[PDB]
Design a protein around this ligand. Structure first.
Ligand code: ADP
Length: 357
C-alpha cells in the first residue's frame, strides 16, 4: 500500500513473476486504475528498467500499453503502465483450448499490425507467444495489446536503418514452443522470426496444440533439439492439416524470408482478410469468448456445463463458429468450412427459446 511516482498507490497483487511482481495500482488524483510492476533493486539480473525504456520508445503505438512512470522507489525499481485484461492463453483456456477460424483470423489481423508497429520502431519482440498478448479492460476489450519487452532488441540503427549483422551460435532461453526454426539453429533473430512465432500461435489456436508439445528430455539442449527436429521434419502441409491454405501460405512465407529482409505485412494481412471474406465473416470484434460469455449469462438466468453453453452459442451464432477438424488431412475449401453453419443450426426445449430473448 506504499506510493510510487508521487501519485500512484499500490493495491492488491495480480501478480508474481521471475522479474518481480505486478500489482493493481491507483492514481490518487484521478482515481484511474493502472498496473504497477515492481523489481527488487537487489535483483541479480535487472530487467524492469530496460523494459520501461523500450515501452517509452514504443509509446503511442496502437495496442502498446502506455507507460505513465518509471524509476526508483526505495528498494524497488517500479513501472506504472496501463491496466490490461486477460491474455490470449487465458482466453484460450476459457474456450477450452480451441479457437474458431473467425476468432483466429481476427486476432491475426490485429497481431500482424502490432508486430508491424514494433518493427517500424526498429525493435523485434523475440518472445512472441499467447501469454504476451492481452486484451484491454472494459471497452478496450476488443483491442489486442502486446506486453513483455524484456527480451526485445534493436534490430536496426534508428537513423540509418542499417540492420544488425548476421550471427550464429546464439543460445536459446525460454520455452521454445513458438520459437522459429532459425532461433533453434542458433541464428541471430530478425523480423521474420517474430512473424514465424506468430504463425505457430495461429496454428496452435486453430488445432488446439502444436505437435512438439509436452516433450521431455534429459537436458535443455536435448529438448530444444527435439523440438527443432519436429519443426524441421514435419512438413508445413502436415503441420497445417485441416486448415485453409492461407495458414500454410503464411508459414511458407515466414520460413522463406531472408535474415535482413523487410516483411510484406500487408500481403500477410490480406491472407486473412481475403479468407474472412471467403468464409463470410464480419470483422466485428465478436470473439469466441465474447459470445460464449454472453450465452452463459442468459442461460444462468463443469466440463459438461460448458458443452451445453457452447452448443447454444453455436446455434445462436451459427455463421461465426467454424472449427478445424483435426482428422482432416487436407486444406478444407471455404464452402467445406461454411457447411458447419448448417450443422450448427441443426443442433438441439425452453432453453433454445430463452437465448433468442
Ligand atoms: N499491464 C498489465 N495489466 C494487467 N495485467 C498484466 C499486465 N502485464 C502483465 N499482466 C499479467 O500479470 C500476470 C503476471 O505477469 P508476469 O508475472 O509479468 O508474467 P509471468 O508470470 O509469465 O512471468 C500475468 O497473468 C499477465 O498476464
Amino acid at each position: 500500500d506504499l506510493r510510487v511516482g508521487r501519485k500512484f498507490r499500490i493495491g492488491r497483487k495480480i501478480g508474481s513473476g521471475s522479474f518481480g511482481d505486478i500489482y493493481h495500482g491507483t492514481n490518487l488524483i484521478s482515481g484511474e486504475e493502472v498496473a504497477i510492476r515492481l523489481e527488487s533493486i537487489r535483483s541479480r539480473h535487472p530487467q524492469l528498467d530496460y523494459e520501461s525504456r523500450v515501452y517509452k520508445y514504443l509509446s503511442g503505438g496502437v495496442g502498446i500499453p502506455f507507460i505513465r512512470w518509471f524509476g526508483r522507489e526505495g528498494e524497488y525499481n517500479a513501472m506504472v503502465i496501463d491496466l490490461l485484461g486477460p491474455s490470449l492463453e487465458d482466453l484460450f483456456n476459457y474456450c477450452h483450448r480451441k479457437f474458431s477460424f473467425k476468432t483466429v483470423i481476427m486476432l491475426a489481423l490485429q497481431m500482424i499490425c502490432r508486430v508491424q508497429y514494433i518493427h517500424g520502431r526498429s525493435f523485434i519482440h523475440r518472445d512472441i507467444k499467447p501469454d504476451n498478448f492481452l486484451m484491454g479492460v472494459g471497452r478496450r476489450g476488443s483491442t489486442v495489446h502486446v506486453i513483455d519487452f524484456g527480451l526485445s532488441k534493436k534490430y536496426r540503427d534508428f537513423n540509418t536503418h542499417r540492420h544488425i549483422p548476421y550471427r550464429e551460435n546464439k543460445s536459446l532461453t525460454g520455452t521454445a514452443r513458438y520459437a522459429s526454426v532459425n532461433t533453434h539453429l542458433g541464428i541471430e533473430q530478425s523480423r521474420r522470426d517474430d512473424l514465424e512465432s506468430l504463425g505457430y500461435m495461429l496454428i496452435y489456436f486453430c488445432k488446439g496444440s502444436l505437435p512438439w508439445q509436452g516433450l521431455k528430455a534429459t537436458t535443455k539442449k536435448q529438448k530444444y533439439d527435439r523440438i527443432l527436429e519436429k519443426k524441421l521434419c514435419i512438413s508445413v502441409e502436415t503441420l497445417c492439416a485441416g486448415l485453409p491454405l492461407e495458414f500454410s501460405e503464411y508459414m511458407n512465407y515466414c520460413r522463406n524470408l531472408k535474415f535482413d529482409e523487410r516483411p510484406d505485412y500487408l500481403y500477410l494481412a490480406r491472407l486473412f482478410k481475403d479468407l474472412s471474406i471467403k468464409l463470410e465473416y464480419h470483422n466485428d470484434h465478436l470473439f469466441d469468448w465474447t459470445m460464449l460469455r454472453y450465452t452463459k449469462a442468459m442461460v444462468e438466468k463443469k466440463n459438461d456445463s460448458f458443452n451445453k453453453v457452447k452448443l447454444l452459442a453455436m446455434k445462436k451464432f451459427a455463421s461465426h463458429f467454424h472449427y478445424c477438424k483435426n482428422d482432416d488431412k487436407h486444406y478444407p475449401t471455404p464452402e467445406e468450412i461454411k457447411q458447419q453453419t448448417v450443422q450448427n443450426n441443426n443442433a438441439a426445449p425452453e432453453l433454445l427459446s430463452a437465448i433468442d430473448k
